[PDB]
């Protein structure tokens, strides 16, 4: 609903499949782990932060 601990280590397409099932309006943004981002909280947005292997490195959450 707001966070997806079960997606840590998953691929981008894997992560998007679970997110879009739970939250079909999600606006999903993929970024490298070491990126600076704004601290707005946007209810429809899910940022996906990825490691060197393009896998989810941090628990995805809404905002």
């Amino acid at each position: 609903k707001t966070e997806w601990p079960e997606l840590v280590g998953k691929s981008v397409e894997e992560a998007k499949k679970v997110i879009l099932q739970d939250k079909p309006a999600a606006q999903i943004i993929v970024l490298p782990v070491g990126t600076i981002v704004t601290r707005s909280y946007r209810i429809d947005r899910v940022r996906l932060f990825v490691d060197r292997l393009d896998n989810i490195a941090q628990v995805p959450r809404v905002g």
């Binding site: 070491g34 990126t35 600076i36 981002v37 704004t38 601290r39 707005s40 909280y41």
Partner: protein, 275 residues
């Protein structure tokens, strides 16, 4: 017609304005996605872009920097909203691109520009979950040079007993600001941890947007500039106070709200802080 967003009143900024203190001649760097300097409710004093392919800091291709800037210093006139420090000298230090993200080196370059240009206050409504030694060095250098450095705590909510305050807010030199609403309740998204310093209004904050527009957004991004603006109000009244004195003054005169893990020292009160 001008409206005063609730957050501006909530921190008691209009008490300062009524005494004749509005942030005049205090230099505040909004280190962010740029500022739309064409907004009729904003006056931008200056700035620089650190983003390689977006070189005009006076254009904001995202919207976030413009909203943050309006909370700091939206003009006192007959339109739009009123900022916390409506006479402050607002500097557009562009370190994020149109998509709202930036490289650590761009942020660090922005911080170095603010130090070299003698900014009095830095606002960073940005961050990431890991720091870097170079980012830490830059904020520590700014504070050692006398700059009041303020940053959003983060919107990472709670994670059991762990701190979720992100960087650069989590560094001791930096004032990490969490978000409350108009009833002084913590926003569910507001990061937590012992590094949380103070809170400010961060929910349904009406401010300026590019294209001569206004709208209300949520985030510790919206909370942070209330505190950067408060720092400017304090310095306009007390131009000889050090960054140490402005910081303790803000921390020591809060309205206490609750558990320091969730609320830090509580809600800033710029009227009390400025005496």
């Amino acid at each position: 017609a001008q409206s005063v967003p609730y957050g501006v009143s909530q921190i008691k900024a209009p008490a300062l304005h009524s005494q004749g203190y509005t942030g005049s001649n205090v230099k505040v760097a909004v280190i962010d996605s740029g500022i739309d300097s064409s907004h009729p409710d904003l006056k931008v004093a200056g700035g620089a872009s650190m983003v390689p392919s977006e070189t005009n800091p006076f254009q904001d291709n995202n919207s976030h920097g413009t909203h943050v800037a309006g909370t700091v210093a939206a003009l006192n006139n007959s339109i739009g909203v009123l900022g916390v420090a409506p006479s402050a000298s607002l500097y557009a230090v562009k370190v994020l691109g149109a998509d709202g993200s930036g490289q650590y080196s761009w942020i660090i370059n922005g911080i170095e520009w603010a130090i070299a240009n003698n900014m009095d206050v830095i606002n960073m409504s940005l961050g990431g979950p890991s720091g870097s030694a170079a980012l830490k060095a830059a904020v520590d250098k700014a504070v050692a040079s006398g700059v009041v450095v303020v940053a959003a705590a983060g919107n990472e909510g709670t994670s059991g007993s762990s701190s979720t305050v992100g960087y650069p807010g989590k560094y001791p030199s930096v004032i990490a600001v969490g978000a409350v609403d108009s009833s002084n309740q913590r926003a569910s998204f507001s990061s937590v941890g012992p590094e949380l310093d103070v809170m400010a209004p961060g929910v349904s904050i009406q401010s300026t947007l590019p294209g001569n527009k206004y709208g209300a957004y949520n985030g510790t991004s919206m909370a942070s500039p209330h505190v950067a603006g408060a720092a400017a109000l304090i310095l306009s009244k007390h131009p000889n106070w050090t960054n140490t004195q402005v910081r303790s003054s803000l921390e020591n005169t809060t309205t206490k709200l609750g558990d320091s893990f969730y609320y830090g020292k509580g809600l800033i009160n710029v009227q009390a802080a400025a005496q």
